[PDB]
Enzyme design. Structure first.
Site, PDB file in Angstrom:
ATOM      1  N   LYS A 179      29.140  47.280  43.778  1.00 45.52           N
ATOM      2  CA  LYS A 179      29.427  47.829  45.079  1.00 45.52           C
ATOM      3  C   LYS A 179      30.271  48.926  45.420  1.00 45.52           C
ATOM      4  CE  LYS A 179      28.825  42.848  47.075  1.00 45.52           C
ATOM      5  NZ  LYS A 179      28.581  42.522  45.802  1.00 45.52           N
ATOM      6  N   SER A 196      32.803  40.378  49.259  1.00 44.14           N
ATOM      7  CA  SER A 196      31.777  40.566  47.919  1.00 44.14           C
ATOM      8  C   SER A 196      30.343  40.172  48.650  1.00 44.14           C
ATOM      9  CB  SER A 196      31.888  39.963  46.634  1.00 44.14           C
ATOM     10  OG  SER A 196      32.892  40.422  46.133  1.00 44.14           O
ATOM     11  N   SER A 222      29.205  42.265  41.232  1.00 42.30           N
ATOM     12  CA  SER A 222      29.735  42.934  42.414  1.00 42.30           C
ATOM     13  C   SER A 222      30.718  44.052  42.204  1.00 42.30           C
ATOM     14  CB  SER A 222      30.346  41.837  43.054  1.00 42.30           C
ATOM     15  OG  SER A 222      29.394  41.057  43.505  1.00 42.30           O
ATOM     16  N   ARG A 279      40.891  36.200  36.907  1.00 42.41           N
ATOM     17  CA  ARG A 279      40.583  37.648  36.714  1.00 42.41           C
ATOM     18  C   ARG A 279      41.907  38.385  37.241  1.00 42.41           C
ATOM     19  NH1 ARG A 279      35.217  37.626  40.422  1.00 42.41           N
ATOM     20  NH2 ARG A 279      36.938  36.568  41.716  1.00 42.41           N
TER      21      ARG A 279
HETATM   22  O1  LIG Z   1      34.827  36.269  43.546  1.00 45.08           O
HETATM   23  C1  LIG Z   1      34.772  36.186  44.623  1.00 45.08           C
HETATM   24  O2  LIG Z   1      36.037  36.069  45.507  1.00 45.08           O
HETATM   25  C2  LIG Z   1      33.716  35.617  45.437  1.00 45.08           C
HETATM   26  C3  LIG Z   1      33.281  35.971  46.404  1.00 45.08           C
HETATM   27  C4  LIG Z   1      32.051  35.601  47.113  1.00 45.08           C
HETATM   28  C5  LIG Z   1      31.238  34.554  46.210  1.00 45.08           C
HETATM   29  C6  LIG Z   1      31.774  33.974  45.128  1.00 45.08           C
HETATM   30  C7  LIG Z   1      30.890  33.197  44.414  1.00 45.08           C
HETATM   31  C8  LIG Z   1      31.680  31.931  43.984  1.00 45.08           C
HETATM   32  C9  LIG Z   1      30.738  30.852  43.428  1.00 45.08           C
HETATM   33  C10 LIG Z   1      29.606  31.052  43.212  1.00 45.08           C
HETATM   34  C11 LIG Z   1      28.815  32.059  43.684  1.00 45.08           C
HETATM   35  C12 LIG Z   1      29.590  33.083  44.475  1.00 45.08           C
HETATM   36  O3  LIG Z   1      28.833  34.225  44.690  1.00 45.08           O
HETATM   37  C13 LIG Z   1      32.875  34.506  44.806  1.00 45.08           C
END
Ligand SMILES: O=C(O)c1cccc(-c2ccccc2O)c1
Ligand SMILES: [Cl-]
Length: 242
Positions: free
Chosen positions: A50, A95, A47, A227
């Protein structure tokens, strides 16, 4: 120009993890990392892609502006925040993969490839499916390559309009207070080993900018909050933020 401080590995090993943080002092044109090798190892951008994807979509008119609404396609997905309408701002914030998959389809292979080469972005390789190559295709980018790309964006030096770059930097806004501004984007790569998390961006101060790019091992989603937390602890240790 580049200094390695292996003692910073403690930020990752204390969480039973491993990773790399890369910092770049724009005023002094000096870089810092805990691991020069991993700083130059190429991973899926996931991501963090993006950022370039938004720039291309805006510059080509696929996206009109940051207010244009991308309607939910009515398919229930497992991320609750994805099951709603979005604009560029909230699509970045949450995301929202399926919105950006449609961007890529409308951009198309030829224009996407040409624009990534123009950006000098990672290995510039879009091999795979046009709507998922940044998740399980052939594109790869290192932490140092992220810094290089982000610096161009900060200075409006990418080969898209100034307007497109201003809008994407608005959409990257993550945190702001009386001491600093962070513009950044998270990433989470699971489809190809090794599974990692990303955080890339920069910190604006009154009289300097510090660019950063980090990735870390991410065997489960339980560690995603590390992170940002680890990065900010590094920034605090180095007196970049209070
Ligand atoms: O990093 C985030 O904040 C985030 C934002 C959207 C979705 C996810 C996600 C988390 C666990 C499994 C799949 C994912 O796609 C994580
Ligand atoms: Cl802003």
């Amino acid at each position: 120009e580049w200094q390695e401080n292996k003692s910073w590995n403690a930020h990752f090993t204390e969480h039973k993890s491993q990773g790399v943080v890369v910092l770049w002092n724009e005023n002094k044109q000096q870089g810092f990392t805990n691991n020069l090798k991993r700083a130059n190892q190429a991973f899926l951008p996931a991501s963090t892609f993006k950022i370039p994807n938004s720039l291309i979509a805006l510059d080509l008119g696929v996206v009109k502006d940051e207010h244009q609404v991308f309607k939910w396609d009515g398919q229930t997905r497992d991320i609750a925040t994805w099951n709603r309408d979005h604009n560029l701002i909230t699509a970045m914030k949450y995301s929202v993969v399926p919105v950006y998959q449609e961007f890529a389809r409308q951009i198309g292979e030829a224009r996407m490839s040409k624009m990534l080469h123009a950006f000098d972005y990672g290995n510039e390789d879009i091999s795979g499916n046009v709507d998922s190559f940044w998740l399980d295709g052939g594109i790869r980018i290192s932490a140092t390559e992220q810094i290089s790309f982000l610096r161009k964006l900060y200075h409006n030096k990418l080969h898209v309009s100034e307007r497109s770059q201003r809008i994407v930097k608005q959409a990257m806004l993550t945190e702001a207070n009386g001491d600093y501004i962070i513009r950044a984007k998270t990433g989470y790569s699971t489809r190809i080993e090794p599974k990692i998390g990303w955080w890339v961006g920069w910190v604006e101060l009154d009289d300097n900018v510090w660019f950063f790019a980090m990735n870390m091992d991410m065997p489960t989603s339980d560690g995603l909050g590390l992170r940002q937390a680890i990065t900010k602890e590094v920034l605090k240790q180095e007196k970049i933020i209070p």
